[PDB]
Structures are given as C-alpha cells and as structure tokens.
C-alpha cells in the first residue's frame, strides 16, 4: 500500500522504486547531479503488459478519445484520503495541461482492453526546462498516472512508469520532475495544501470543512465574507500585449527559488493567457501604463462522491503570483475576490514560494493533503517549501 506520512514510509519496502535511479528514503543527499549516466542505447520495444491489454497513444485532438480520457480520470483518478472527493479535470483543461509547446503524441501513453477497447490506464509526459539549484536541464513533467479501479494492484503502474521512461529516453531526456500525494523515494521538497473558504455553507454541508465546535454557521459566514470588487488600482485580465512583460516579470521573480520552470515566451502565452474555466491571469497596469504585477489561478473542480444534492466542488488553485509594486497580500486578497465573483467554492494554495506570508492572514485553513515534489535521476539536497517555485496541474 501507499504511505501518506514519513512515519508510514519508513516502514515500507519499495520493490519498484528500489530499482529506479532515485535516492533512498533513508539517505541524506550531499551532492548535485545525475543518479546514473545517460544511456546511449535505448530499449526499442514497448514493455509487456498483462494478457489482454495493449498500448495505445491517445490523440487528444480526437474529441471522442479526449472524452475517453476525461472519463477514465473522472472515475478513477486521485481521491482525498477519506474517499470523499475526486479530481474532475475537464476535457478542455486536459488539452491545456497535455498540449503545451513541444508536446509529443507518444508521450500521451494509454492502456486499452484488447477486446472491448476500454481505456483502463494512462500516464503522460510534457517537456519542460527545469532550474534546480545551479543547474538548468531539459526534463519532462510526468502527470496523470491513472490505473482503472478494476485493474489495480496488478503491477500496471510500474509498467506505465517504465514505458513512459523509455519513450522519454528515446527523445534524449534523462531527468524528470513530478509530484505525489504519497511519500516515495525521495522527496526534494514537501508542501502542504491550504484552503480559503469562499462558500462555507456548501463546504460544511459536503464535509469538505467542519464548523469548529465553538463557532456557529452565522459566525463562519461572516468570518469569510469578502468585498464585492478587488481593490488594486489597474487590475485587469491579461491580454496578448502583456505576454512579453508577464514573461519578464515571471523570469526575474523565479530566480529567488531553488526549483523553478524556465519558460519561453511561447510557454508563457500557453500557461497564462486566459481561457474561461481553465486559467485566469490578471495583471496590474499602473498609472504610467506599465504592468508591474500579476496573479493567476487555474480551475479544477472535484467530484463530491456519493452525495445526493451537491455533486461538484468548484475549486480555484493558486498558480504563479508575481509582485514588484503591489504587496503580495493585496494581490492575493484580490485573487480571493475574483474567485468569489467567478463562483468558486474554495480557493486553494500550497505553502511554497512566499505563500506562507499570506496564508494565515487571509484566513486560509491548513489541509489534510500533502504534495511531495520529486526529481528522477537527479541527486540534490532537499529544500524547504518556501524554496519550491514550481506549480504542476
């Protein structure tokens, strides 16, 4: 089984991860570099799946195939620790997350049942330039590892991981970054989700939160009430003319952290240009016409499992927030107001980058879910959450 805490994880043997070029959970890392040298001959044949299952690369430009992936994740992807909420990535969100600049069709790696053609497994890779301490490396980001509930505990996830590794190796890339809600060998950083209630009545009704014993519903609703409009002068949605300055602002802002993406201007357009119900970015254009700050958050609802009335929890997730003239506290306050205006029930943020400076002050409450950060085939010292400067969807 999986381990959510470092306690549980110390008691595990990792039959798969012991075979992989990652550090052991027990060791402390005092060096910087690849775990193993680059391979100059790569396995040409796909790894063998169990009988009755076949590989199939997913063309997400086919609407029907995209909907099959939507359905696999909607029914079988990540749940909270109490099996009450499950991610509900939309088809259009999946296209955003899975076709950034440089995406490859072979890195959308599906498993189908041979007879029925049912999609029962998936894993993905997208290319990314990653800055880790003093090194910049072309890597991939791994995401959406999913095995159908009926196919579980049959060692299909290790096969998915080895096959995407092989397909990435064929393109000359030997490092990866990824996250997980569980502890694996070996986290480079550990983050914690925090939650800012926007519609506390619904959150309590669906048991996403609870009334804290000595507070009433009326007190809780007043506690989380927000202004109707944002307060920062010149706040407006990002437009095409802002792409260069958003790129510049982000590039300079990220230098202070130890694990960050290095985005081209085209990647900046992809990741930040607003798309309704996927990604929102607002810039601050001052009295001189200069863009000095920006905030962004992505749209990711959760299915509320087995509930008769409320079926979906509308969640906004803090993405990248860059401040040079507006205080970060004011920026995030305006993000909360905008998310409330757009109908979200909760605003989520990790404790990475400078987020701890605003979490308690803006009335976020700590969550029960960790987000561990990992590198594959890269040895380096771990870092505190405040030095993680990378957000994956």
């Amino acid at each position: 089984g999986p381990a959510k805490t470092m306690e549980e994880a110390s008691k595990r043997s990792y039959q798969f991860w012991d075979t992989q070029p990652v550090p052991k959970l027990g060791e402390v890392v005092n060096t910087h570099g690849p775990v193993e040298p680059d391979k100059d001959n790569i396995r040409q044949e796909p790894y063998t799946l169990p009988q009755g299952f076949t590989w199939d690369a997913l063309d997400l430009g086919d609407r029907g195939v995209l909907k099959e992936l939507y359905t696999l994740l909607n029914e079988n992807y990540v749940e909270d620790d109490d099996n009450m909420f499950r991610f509900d990535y939309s088809p259009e969100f999946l296209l955003w997350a899975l076709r950034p600049p440089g995406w490859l069709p072979q890195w959308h790696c599906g498993v189908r049942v041979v007879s029925s053609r049912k999609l029962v497994g998936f894993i993905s890779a997208i290319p990314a330039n990653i800055h880790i301490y003093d090194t910049e490396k072309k890597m991939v980001e791994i995401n959406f590892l999913c095995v159908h509930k009926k196919l579980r505990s049959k060692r299909v996830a290790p096969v998915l991981i080895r096959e995407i590794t092989r397909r990435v190796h064929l393109e000359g890339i030997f490092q990866a970054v990824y996250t997980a809600g569980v502890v694996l060998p070996k986290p480079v950083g550990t983050c914690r989700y925090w939650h800012r209630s926007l519609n506390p009545r619904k959150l309590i009704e669906v048991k996403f939160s609870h009334l804290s014993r000595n507070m009433t519903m009326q007190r809780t609703m007043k506690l989380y009430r927000l202004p109707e409009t944002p307060k920062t002068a010149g706040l407006r949605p990002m437009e095409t003319k802002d792409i260069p300055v958003v790129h510049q602002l982000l590039t300079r802002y990220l230098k202070q952290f130890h694990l960050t993406p290095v985005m081209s201007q085209e990647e900046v357009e992809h990741w930040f240009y607003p798309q309704e119900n996927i990604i929102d970015t607002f810039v601050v254009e001052n009295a001189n016409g200069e863009v000095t700050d920006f905030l962004s958050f992505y749209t990711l609802p959760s299915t509320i499992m087995n509930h008769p009335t409320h079926k979906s929890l509308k969640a906004a997730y803090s993405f990248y927030n860059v401040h040079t003239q507006t205080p970060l506290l004011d920026l995030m306050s305006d993000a909360l107001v905008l998310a409330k205006m757009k109908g979200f029930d909760v605003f989520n943020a990790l404790d990475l980058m400078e987020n701890k400076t605003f979490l308690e002050k803006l009335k976020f409450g700590i969550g029960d879910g960790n987000l561990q950060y990992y590198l594959y085939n890269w040895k380096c010292p771990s870092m505190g959450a405040e030095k993680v400067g990378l957000v994956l969807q």
């Binding site: 909270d80 909420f85 991610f87 996250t179 809600g181 989700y193 969550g367």
Partner: peptide, 8 residues
C-alpha cells in the same frame, strides 16, 4: 499527479 486535500 496532484493530490486532493480538504480542510483539516
């Protein structure tokens, strides 16, 4: 993959 958190 990401992880699903709720309020402690």
């Amino acid at each position: 993959g990401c992880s699903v958190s709720k309020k402690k």
